[PDB]
């Protein structure tokens, strides 16, 4: 093994800024250190092979430098389509090895949230179970706190975050917020709203509903 460690680990540059990732190597590497870009959710892709060789397809704002032990990977200017996690690795000896990884979240400007409170699914509510989903969509930062309310009340322990990876068009996170109050209670009540405060959109906001049926 020849421990390979990148740096920094999870950084936060901007669009038009040059992101420069560097990865030292326990021992010697020579020209044997590639690079990969692993977009959110996919598989690694090869961005640079043998210290400073570019791949076909891969842009030109990407490039490698030097060789020896100190290595560095640089981005002319960063685009919202570069919200990946980049890896370095070497193939001189074996086993092969990779860096602990460098994430690269893109920084933009506040895009105040959008909610779309979806009442329950007629039939889910046939399980003795029933979940009221809440959704904001395309915002930034990721700092968003959803406040669930029943008939202007609550009982908590039902909420549950899950937000997406930064979009590579906008660079805006989005998170759902399922309230799964199960059956027999969706009935016992009638307004389950879904208030929602965020860093950029002052004075809280919500999409609710007094239900509207039986």
């Amino acid at each position: 093994d020849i421990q390979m460690t990148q740096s920094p680990s999870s950084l936060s540059a901007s669009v038009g800024d040059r992101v420069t990732i560097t990865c030292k190597a326990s021992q010697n590497i020579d020209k044997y250190l590639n690079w990969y870009q692993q977009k959110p959710g996919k598989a690694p892709k090869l961005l640079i092979y043998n210290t400073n060789n570019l791949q076909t397809g891969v842009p030109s704002r990407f490039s490698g430098s030097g060789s020896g032990t100190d290595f560095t990977f640089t981005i002319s200017s960063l685009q919202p389509e570069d919200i990946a996690t980049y890896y370095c690795l070497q193939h001189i000896s074996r086993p092969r090895t990779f860096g602990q990884g460098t994430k690269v979240e893109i920084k933009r400007t506040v895009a105040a949230p959008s909610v779309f409170i979806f009442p329950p699914s007629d039939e889910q509510l046939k399980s003795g179970t029933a979940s009221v989903v809440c959704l904001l969509n395309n915002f930034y930062p990721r700092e968003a706190k959803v406040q669930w309310k029943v008939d202007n009340a609550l009982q908590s322990g039902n909420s549950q975050e899950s937000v997406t990876e930064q979009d590579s068009k906008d660079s805006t996170y989005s998170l759902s917020s399922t309230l799964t109050l199960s059956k027999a209670d969706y009935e016992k009540h009638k307004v389950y709203a879904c208030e929602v405060t965020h860093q950029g959109l002052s004075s809280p906001v919500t999409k609710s509903f007094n239900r509207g049926e039986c």
Partner: protein, 210 residues
């Protein structure tokens, strides 16, 4: 151009044995080393090892780590590239990748997609998709196991506007994500929008109409 799709059991009982197949098409092992790559939940890839072309005989060289358990090999007649791990434990969990070491581009120029192999003394579970009515649309693919579950609308057409979320493990000890895709204000006539929740671990298919 070229294709490298994986395959294999999605959940595996500890003690039992891991089994995956890299079905290839667009090149040959006769001029290419086929190695694998694994990545546990939110972590970093780890080279398991590879196998050599026709010249070198199809010899194999495992990373010191697994060596002793792994056992790659290839059936040039069925254009595959099988991997077998004995003694799978909660540690050998990840997405197992089959990259195709190339020419200079090496190592690793063409990776497969992904195949999550979860090790759990648990069992399967067919997901439930609940048509979430609305502007936005979505689907609730509720209560299932093991992961990952993949959903795509209108078996194509609809992209740019979709937000298929991650997953959360419910106290039920079950997973539950919910794919959503905002659509244009007016453009919801007596129209279609199928919901293609796919889920291999179970062997279950559902195309709910939101």
């Amino acid at each position: 151009q070229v294709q490298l799709q994986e395959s294999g059991p999605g959940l595996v009982r500890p003690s039992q044995t891991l089994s995956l197949t890299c079905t290839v098409s667009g090149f040959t092992f006769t001029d290419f080393y086929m190695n694998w790559v694994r990545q546990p939940p939110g972590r970093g890839l780890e080279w398991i090892g590879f196998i050599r072309d026709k010249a070198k005989g199809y010899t194999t060289e495992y990373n010191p780590s697994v060596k002793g358990r792994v056992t790659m090999l290839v059936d040039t007649s069925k254009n595959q590239f099988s991997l077998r791990l004995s003694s799978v434990t909660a540690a050998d969990t990840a997405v197992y990748y089959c990259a195709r070491e190339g020419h200079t581009a090496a190592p690793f120029d063409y990776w497969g997609q992904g195949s999550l192999v979860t090790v759990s003394s648990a069992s399967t579970k067919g997901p439930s998709v609940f048509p979430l009515a609305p502007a936005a649309l979505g689907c609730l693919v509720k209560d299932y196991f093991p992961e990952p579950v993949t959903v795509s609308w209108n078996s194509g057409a609809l992209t740019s506007g979709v937000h298929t979320f991650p997953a959360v493990l419910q106290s039920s000890g079950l997973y539950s994500l919910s794919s959503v895709v905002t659509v244009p204000s007016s453009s919801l006539g007596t129209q279609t929008y199928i919901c293609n929740v796919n889920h291999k671990p179970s062997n279950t298919k559902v195309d709910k109409k939101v």
